[PDB]
Ligand binder design. Structure first.
Ligand SMILES: O=S(=O)(Nc1ccc(F)c2cnccc12)c1cc(Cl)cc(Cl)c1O
Length: 354
């Protein structure tokens, strides 16, 4: 690897690992369209298994970028429109609060205060219908952003309904397979269990538990190589030969709402580049934030910091890229450590290399 990349990565990540007590970590830097990989520590402490380029990590909310792109692909296929009312794809959702709530609102967390988590008691299709029927919005649609698994997760579930495919089958056929993400999974198959890292929470080895809309909101597991490929695909969508997938990637990086310095895409979030790190971190506190509509949405802006953070009980992930500079980073760790430290490290590395 070029010595500049080796040096900035090791000099940034080694102290991070020490300060945060991270058991294992994988990092990829994409520099002028080429990936460079780094690994440290342990995927499984007890069995002394090291982190490798084939280790699977839980992506947590980074999964939402996949959901956003899959939704974009469905738009490009003509199967859904973001202006469609939610009720077009779930006619059983008859409660009057749903009038005026569209697929865009679900995908961008602007439906009017859908909650961060689906309750654990919700299991069956009927439990989920009941949950959404009984939810009372605090705000009118399209006025405030409140980050919510129950929002984007419902978007993902409804976006695949016209296809007739399950969410997992649609994701595999329409996103993972075309991009050659052959070690990226919604459910880890037995054959790959040897590569599935354990997460660590308070010293205990843990994996994410099943839950309603888990696949759509936080369910993807992936390797550092596949995530590097995902970043490359999002940096250079025009290189993608499947027309609807190229278009869906573009749609997911469009700017639909603004709050402060941040713009909301489909799954992805964006800021204008050059960007101050403090501003990036300005968005631990669950915040209700008024949004301004971008009417119509701005197509993907190349001079952007495009990013997403993710966590599960035992894992912490971060992805960021700058399309204008052909530069990106993926950081995967098997401990959920604070987001500001992730952003600080990513910015140190990418700013050094741009
Ligand atoms: O819901 S999440 O999508 N991930 C998770 C799912 C399931 C869990 F039990 C999690 C337990 N701890 C942390 C995250 C969990 C999510 C939420 C938030 Cl407020 C921030 C990020 Cl970064 C994120 O990924």
């Amino acid at each position: 690897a070029p010595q500049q990349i080796n040096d900035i990565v090791h000099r940034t990540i080694t102290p991070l690992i020490e300060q945060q007590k991270i058991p294992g970590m994988a990092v990829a830097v994409i520099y002028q369209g080429k990936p460079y990989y780094f690994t440290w520590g342990y995927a499984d402490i007890a069995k002394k298994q090291p982190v490798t380029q084939q280790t699977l990590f839980e992506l947590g909310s980074v999964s939402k970028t996949f959901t956003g792109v899959l939704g974009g692909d469905a738009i490009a296929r003509g199967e859904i429109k973001l202006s469609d009312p939610t009720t077009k794809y779930w006619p059983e959702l008859t409660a009057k609060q749903w009038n005026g709530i569209t697929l865009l609102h679900l995908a961008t967390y602007t439906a009017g205060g859908l909650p961060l988590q689906v309750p654990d008691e919700v299991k069956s299709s009927s439990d989920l219908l009941r949950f959404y029927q009984n939810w009372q919005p605090a705000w009118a649609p399209g006025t405030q952003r409140l980050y919510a698994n129950s929002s984007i997760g419902l978007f993902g579930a409804l976006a695949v309904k016209p296809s007739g495919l399950s969410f997992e089958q649609a994701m595999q056929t329409r996103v993972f397979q075309p991009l050659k993400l052959n070690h990226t999974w919604i459910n880890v198959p037995p054959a790959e269990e040897k590569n599935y890292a354990w997460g660590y929470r308070e010293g205990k080895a843990v994996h994410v538990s099943p839950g309603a809309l888990d696949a759509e909101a936080y369910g993807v597991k992936s390797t550092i190589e596949d995530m590097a490929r995902w970043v490359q695909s999002n940096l250079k969508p025009l290189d993608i030969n499947e027309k609807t997938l190229q278009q869906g990637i573009q749609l997911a990086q469009s700017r639909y709402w603004q709050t402060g310095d941040m713009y909301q895409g489909l799954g992805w979030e964006m800021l204008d580049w050059p960007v101050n790190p403090d501003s990036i971190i300005n968005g631990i506190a669950l915040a209700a934030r008024p949004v301004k509509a971008i009417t119509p949405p701005t197509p993907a802006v190349r001079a952007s910091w495009v990013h997403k953070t993710g966590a599960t009980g035992g894992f912490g992930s971060y992805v960021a890229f700058i399309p204008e500079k052909e530069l990106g980073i993926v950081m995967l760790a098997n401990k959920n450590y604070p987001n500001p430290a992730r952003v600080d490290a990513a910015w140190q590395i990418l700013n050094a290399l741009q």
